[PDB]
Amino acid sequence: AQICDEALQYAARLRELEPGWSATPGCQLHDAEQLWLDPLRAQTDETFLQRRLRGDWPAEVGNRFANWLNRAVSSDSQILGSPEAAQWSQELSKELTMFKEILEDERD
Amino acid sequence: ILSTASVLAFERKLDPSDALMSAGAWAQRDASQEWPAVTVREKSVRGTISNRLKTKDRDPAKLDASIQSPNLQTVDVANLPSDADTLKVRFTLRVLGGAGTPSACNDAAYRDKLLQTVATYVNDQGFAELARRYAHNLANARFLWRNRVGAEAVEVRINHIRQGEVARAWRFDALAIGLRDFKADAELDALAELIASGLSGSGHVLLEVVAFARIGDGQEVFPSQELILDKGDKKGQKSKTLYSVRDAAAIHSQKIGNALRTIDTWYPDEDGLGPIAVEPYGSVTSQGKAYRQPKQKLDFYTLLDNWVLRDEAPAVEQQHYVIANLIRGGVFGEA
Amino acid sequence: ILSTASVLAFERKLDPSDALMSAGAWAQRDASQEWPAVTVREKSVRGTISNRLKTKDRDPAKLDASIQSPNLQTVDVANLPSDADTLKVRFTLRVLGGAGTPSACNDAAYRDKLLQTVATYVNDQGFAELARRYAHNLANARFLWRNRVGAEAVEVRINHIRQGEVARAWRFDALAIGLRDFKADAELDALAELIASGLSGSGHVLLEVVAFARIGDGQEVFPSQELILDKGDKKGQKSKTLYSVRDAAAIHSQKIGNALRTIDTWYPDEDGLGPIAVEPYGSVTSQGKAYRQPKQKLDFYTLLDNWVLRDEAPAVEQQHYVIANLIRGGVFGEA
Amino acid sequence: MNAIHIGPFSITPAARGLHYGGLPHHQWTLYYGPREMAIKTLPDSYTSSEVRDEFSDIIAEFVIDARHRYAPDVLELVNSDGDAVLARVAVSRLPEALSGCIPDDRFPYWLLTASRPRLGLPVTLNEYTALAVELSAPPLAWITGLLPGEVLTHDAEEWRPPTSWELRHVVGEGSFTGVSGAAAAALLGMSATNFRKYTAGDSAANRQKISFAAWHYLLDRLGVKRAS
Amino acid sequence: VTDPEALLLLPRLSIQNANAISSPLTWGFPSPGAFTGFVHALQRRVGISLDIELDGVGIVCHRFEAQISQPAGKRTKVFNLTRNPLNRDGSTAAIVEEGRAHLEVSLLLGVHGDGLDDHPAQEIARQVQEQAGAMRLAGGSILPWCNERFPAPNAELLMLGGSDEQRRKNQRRLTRRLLPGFALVSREALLQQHLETLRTTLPEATTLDALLDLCRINFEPPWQVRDKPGWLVPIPAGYNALSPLYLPGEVRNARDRETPLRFVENLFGLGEWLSPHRVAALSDLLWYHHAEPDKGLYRWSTPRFV
């Protein structure tokens, strides 16, 4: 839970940055996460990207973060054989369900 | 004392080239030298939400808000030109030989015992059944995976190149040669004898295999699909890309090799489904189920260890399977 | 008491350049100066389980779960174009000389004794057997490591570049001159005296070596493979990375130098393998073992210490091995 | 002031003194023989204990790196499955019968190396007991990686007596064995002054070279080499 | 002691030079008693005129900077000082080591009373904000945000929600407002159960040692670190009686001769900094006074937390 808390905290200090840093030019700038990285670009663009975050409601990004969280687990076959991986997947699914629900109502 | 070597790296035999895809009309195949190559193109798709829901997306208003925002992708598609009902696919296959000699090994005693076991196998029953089955997998366009499934007619030409010129041409008919029946044919026996000479180290064998499949005018062909890093946006998400070399769609060489390896009809389960690929633990990824499980002791590793260390020679079809696994190569040993 | 010097670093003779790979066709090799280079491209590979399971992954459900999660990778691949069957490899070899003189030597008197030992070697027999064997490794394309195990025909052209121009040309057949026998040939002897004059110090020797291999149209050519940092995601893992210099596949220089070094036939094991590389303690990476063990008293250090410190000169084959290690060079002496 | 000798380590100051801040300072230098590892500016009001504690972190880091750099190899005795490690023994050298090995059901117990291409042999418990008796490493074996090869060899003609530096690796002050001069003299059966003649170098007077049998028995008793 | 009918969010407040020495044993973030006293001073100054009560404060602490320095050769820290004026003879006065800290905190205030029905929410919110913009929070002046880009008004949210989902959405929006910070809560139950765990580990262990063990990094031999549930700071938990409660005119040189004085000693407890999304409701974070004046024990805590 603490880790996803820090993710929100990271997004929290991403509220302290420029309003339109996500609209800068670049070949690769993680545009899948950019709807949640910069919430203030909806003030910058009236209809180019303001309606995109409202219509899309980006909550799958934490699943990508869950993939990064899948790099936080040990590569042990004993956990996968036993129900330890089942409990890990259950608590991971619950906490990223909470994270996706947090990321869903960012428009209010 | 003859323990199995910790490294038993094997170079793969039957090395295939990358199978280039072009398109044209049927009965122009004899003039198919300068056919225009199939080009991977972009097309935009929007889609409704059509996966199974997890009993919380099944609310009416929430599903209504889901369908009101269709998901957007740009998919790479490979289509024939509209004045073309036939797809041509070209690759080359190299038959090397020395199938029992590992490229990397640790124990020289185990290497010599494995070499003597493979030489014993060549001595009683040389590379004939495996070469006939590989000839059948060349005869039918199994390397046209989803790409001869709905084909009205499939034809396969296998040419033998000696000094830059053709030596023996093998024009086939892939509808007659089934994907399940390993029968006998005189041209198939000749191709089996050529792959026999290649696999036994008697000579060098390089085969140019061209498959013409009658799918349809402007229809969809199915090349190898690549991997997407997903570094773009969500509207043009690029959810699917197809493999090409130089503005010319193609199939991966390992896909062709897995097509030629589908000869294994000796797995302990029922063989009414058909042949599966040559592999340890008989694992087909479409079914998701492993025949030749290590519980049944019919996998490659248990049979190879029983054959070499304990000198328990298996059934003749099973040692055919073991030597076919050595032909396909691997990183056998400790991993 | 004339002990060994603590620092005995030696510079390498026979310095090879990086071996650039290009692509082309047979019988156009007389005008192969414009040939497009082999480009290290990328292709996606999907794999199932093919390694030995450690008795806990052998359960059917766990194995099938591992099958349903295939290991997707991207691999750097080097293939010829579909109209190109010939792989060209070009490298320059510079023969220096002064192999007796160390780059660093703590003990003067030891330096004088080692110089006198090399001088009495050359007065007994000059750089003639070693240069003949190095010229044999020049003539056969042993520097074409895996681009010769399935090649139909290999050809090697060696030019003596004196003042930026060809002073003497040699053309060979790399398949006739095998990787096992050190026979005698007139052009091979002339190249042997050229390498002899380079190694003694008579003149400056630079050789441009061009290799052509009949692999096959569109077949996979094998450059040297780099080292993987293993930092990215498991999807785009980049399991294999090949070596290129400027958008152009190449073999590492030390790989070429090791393949030219493969002349050591006088190791105490049998001649079943053939020549190995001249290493201290005669190491072979593929076999995973060391010929010329220090226990059997035929390693480079024991032979050199008997030859220099206590004047116990070995047999002329072991003298050739010691002088070949001095040509090879290394950080000899106690660290 | 003067140098601080911690085993093979020498903390020697520069003779020049600087005045960093307002207080006088000296540039203290830490050597492991000829190689310096840390040059640090320390006050002249520092005692010898504080100068020692300033470099103690780098000293402990070098000790940890030497332990993890010259650690002896590990042989694992496993069952027929080859996964459950039944026993582990740190060996000074591997058996000569080792070859590339994967365990089978043909033999109940197998011996393997801890390296990734594991080398091993089918062993019984008596033969594994004999191999472990013959080849086991002593506990402080890593100090043999910090000694030259010519002072550890068992042949007479290829053996050089160790210097005061290589003796101070294992004998006195902050040596890697952890013993003092009196304890290492008690293990060798010689007097304190007679062994202090061995440890102290400088001029040839009151300084002798240790013999072959005394040096080898000292390394046997200290648990550095040849101590099964 | 009561459930708030509304929650008033005082925004990012930049306190300039707050008392970094929170307690005789702890330094850093100031005492929660300072925040509760500030809210009671706000109720004393402008709360009565608005017919509302202001009890309970939730601290978020969006930014902390300590006016400290690390001297060379020491792993500890020292406090940067201010040059006091000279004495009447021109000499330097005796230095009292006082540390300062620049804070940026936002406060959740529990509002209950009939005046919430008598005024608009933004009116009472703006009145308490403009009252708080000329006050002090821990000994430091409050920077009232002049000539920046976008100033932040309050958002008084009524806790009497019509529906549970609307109340949940209001609490999540109010948590999203105070996002780059950490709610500081009281952990008497956690400290007591850790004291019981140490008493099972080793007897006659005081609560001070259990508080100390929950703050130091414990290194365990096989060398790993003994983990902690949260941040687990040592906070001043209130004041305990050190003298009988004397008469208002009894104590010489008191602040006023109408308020009774009693000499006290600092009470030390365990506090925890959490991300504010890890709470059921934002009214759990409110710091309440709790006097119990017959037995000393003048505490501040977070009741109704868990």
Short mmCIF file of C-alpha atoms in Angstrom, two decimals, chain E residues 147-252:
data_model
loop_
_atom_site.label_atom_id
_atom_site.label_comp_id
_atom_site.label_asym_id
_atom_site.label_seq_id
_atom_site.Cartn_x
_atom_site.Cartn_y
_atom_site.Cartn_z
CA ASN E 147 1.40 38.29 -5.87
CA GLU E 148 1.81 34.66 -6.90
CA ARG E 149 -0.06 32.96 -9.76
CA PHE E 150 -3.19 31.40 -8.28
CA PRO E 151 -4.20 31.81 -4.62
CA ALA E 152 -6.09 29.06 -2.85
CA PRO E 153 -9.37 29.78 -1.02
CA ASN E 154 -10.82 27.30 1.45
CA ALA E 155 -13.37 24.57 0.76
CA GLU E 156 -15.70 23.99 3.70
CA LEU E 157 -17.34 20.60 3.13
CA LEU E 158 -20.36 19.62 5.20
CA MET E 159 -19.88 16.21 6.81
CA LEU E 160 -23.67 15.65 6.97
CA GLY E 161 -23.80 14.04 3.55
CA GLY E 162 -27.14 13.28 1.94
CA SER E 163 -25.81 9.97 0.60
CA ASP E 164 -22.87 7.74 1.49
CA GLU E 165 -21.49 7.90 -2.06
CA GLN E 166 -21.67 11.71 -2.14
CA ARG E 167 -19.95 11.88 1.26
CA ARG E 168 -17.30 9.46 -0.01
CA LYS E 169 -16.75 11.55 -3.16
CA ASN E 170 -16.49 14.72 -1.06
CA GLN E 171 -13.91 13.13 1.25
CA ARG E 172 -11.89 11.83 -1.70
CA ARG E 173 -11.92 15.26 -3.37
CA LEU E 174 -10.84 16.89 -0.09
CA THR E 175 -8.05 14.30 0.18
CA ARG E 176 -7.05 15.08 -3.42
CA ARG E 177 -6.77 18.77 -2.48
CA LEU E 178 -4.27 18.08 0.34
CA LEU E 179 -2.28 15.54 -1.67
CA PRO E 180 1.51 16.38 -1.40
CA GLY E 181 1.67 15.86 2.35
CA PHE E 182 1.35 13.42 5.22
CA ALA E 183 -1.33 13.27 7.89
CA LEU E 184 0.24 13.20 11.36
CA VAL E 185 -1.77 10.98 13.72
CA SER E 186 -1.42 9.69 17.28
CA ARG E 187 -0.48 6.05 17.94
CA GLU E 188 -1.10 5.39 21.64
CA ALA E 189 -2.45 1.91 20.86
CA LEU E 190 0.54 1.00 18.66
CA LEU E 191 3.03 2.32 21.23
CA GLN E 192 1.26 0.45 24.04
CA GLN E 193 1.20 -2.83 22.12
CA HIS E 194 4.87 -2.38 21.20
CA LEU E 195 5.55 -1.79 24.90
CA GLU E 196 3.77 -5.07 25.67
CA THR E 197 5.80 -6.79 22.94
CA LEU E 198 9.04 -5.50 24.47
CA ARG E 199 7.86 -6.50 27.96
CA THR E 200 7.35 -10.02 26.64
CA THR E 201 10.82 -9.70 25.08
CA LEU E 202 12.38 -8.24 28.24
CA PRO E 203 10.66 -7.24 31.53
CA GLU E 204 10.75 -3.91 33.47
CA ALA E 205 10.92 -1.97 30.19
CA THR E 206 9.48 1.54 30.37
CA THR E 207 7.34 3.28 27.76
CA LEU E 208 10.33 5.54 27.01
CA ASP E 209 12.38 2.56 25.81
CA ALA E 210 9.49 1.33 23.65
CA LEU E 211 9.19 4.83 22.19
CA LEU E 212 12.94 4.91 21.52
CA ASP E 213 12.89 1.46 19.88
CA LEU E 214 10.16 2.65 17.49
CA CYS E 215 12.40 5.48 16.23
CA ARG E 216 15.95 4.13 16.00
CA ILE E 217 16.96 1.85 13.14
CA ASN E 218 17.50 -1.54 14.75
CA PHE E 219 20.17 -3.69 13.11
CA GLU E 220 19.69 -7.42 13.61
CA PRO E 221 22.46 -10.02 13.23
CA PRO E 222 21.96 -12.95 10.80
CA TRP E 223 22.73 -7.85 8.90
CA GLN E 224 19.20 -6.62 8.19
CA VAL E 225 17.12 -3.74 9.59
CA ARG E 226 14.12 -4.33 11.84
CA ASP E 227 11.19 -2.80 9.98
CA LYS E 228 8.55 -0.36 11.21
CA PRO E 229 4.83 -0.08 10.38
CA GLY E 230 5.10 3.62 9.45
CA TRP E 231 7.22 6.71 9.92
CA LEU E 232 6.79 6.52 13.74
CA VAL E 233 8.11 9.86 14.96
CA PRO E 234 8.38 10.73 18.67
CA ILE E 235 5.85 13.49 19.32
CA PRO E 236 5.08 15.58 22.42
CA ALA E 237 1.86 13.91 23.54
CA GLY E 238 0.83 16.54 26.09
CA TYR E 239 1.63 17.74 29.59
CA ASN E 240 1.53 15.83 32.88
CA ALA E 241 1.12 17.38 36.32
CA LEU E 242 4.29 18.33 38.20
CA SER E 243 2.61 20.48 40.87
CA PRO E 244 -0.85 21.05 42.37
CA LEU E 245 -3.11 23.46 40.50
CA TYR E 246 -2.37 26.73 42.27
CA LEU E 247 -4.74 29.69 42.56
CA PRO E 248 -4.85 32.29 39.73
CA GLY E 249 -3.18 34.91 41.91
CA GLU E 250 -0.94 32.43 43.72
CA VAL E 251 1.80 31.94 41.13
CA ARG E 252 4.26 34.82 40.93
#
